Amino acid sequence: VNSFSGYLKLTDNVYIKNADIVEEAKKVKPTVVVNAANVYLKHGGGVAGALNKATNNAMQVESDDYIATNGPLKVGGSCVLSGHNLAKHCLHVVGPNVNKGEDIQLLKSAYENFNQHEVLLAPLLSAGIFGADPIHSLRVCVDTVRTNVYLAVFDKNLYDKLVSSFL
Ligand SMILES: O=C(O)CCc1nc2ccccc2[nH]c1=O
């Protein structure tokens, strides 16, 4: 048993809810929250900007030190950093950004990072401002992630559509 509440079960291991991932992280304090990161760990907008703002910019300070030491992530890659006040850990995962022209086939590689963690609170990768089709992102998630994932969908109207179209 875990502390996640009000989720619709989609599969054996994937759950979904209409929720603000920041508010959800603050309530649950999960072991792992996933960030919709870019390769520079520049947390400006979407889930990254919102998560970073909730940490009072401590996420960005830690991220800048990580990049200064290690250089940029790969598209499809990830790193584990602190969860600050939101979670034990933050898994920063880089899905492909369609609005920058990145290969959508890298979305499966991005979701494979989730399999290194038994339970995660996450957004849909490559969705929203990343420019990919969220229905596609949910399908790749269900077909790739084998660990237990609690998906927070921010947009109410998109959520109504993801549930009603899910196969
Ligand atoms: O809802 C999410 O969690 C996915 C990212 C996202 N997609 C949208 C699509 C259309 C309109 C608003 C949107 N807001 C969003 O946050």
Curated annotation (Swiss-Prot):
It is a multi-pass membrane protein. Inhibited in vitro by GRL-0617. It catalyses: Thiol-dependent hydrolysis of ester, thioester, amide, peptide and isopeptide bonds formed by the C-terminal Gly of ubiquitin (a 76-residue protein attached to proteins as an intracellular targeting signal). It comes from the Viruses. Changing S164L: In strain: Gamma/P.1. Changing T31A: In strain: Mu/B.1.621. Residues 1-167 form the Macro domain. It is found in: Host endoplasmic reticulum membrane. Responsible for the cleavages located at the N-terminus of the replicase polyprotein. Participates together with nsp4 in the assembly of virally-induced cytoplasmic double-membrane vesicles necessary for viral replication. Antagonizes innate immune induction of type I interferon by blocking the phosphorylation, dimerization and subsequent nuclear translocation of host IRF3. Also prevents host NF-kappa-B signaling. In addition, PL-PRO possesses a deubiquitinating/deISGylating activity and processes both 'Lys-48'- and 'Lys-63'-linked polyubiquitin chains from cellular substrates. May form homohexamers. Interacts with N protein. This is Papain-like protease nsp3. It comes from Severe acute respiratory syndrome coronavirus 2. The chain holds residues 1025 to 1191 of 7096 of the full protein.
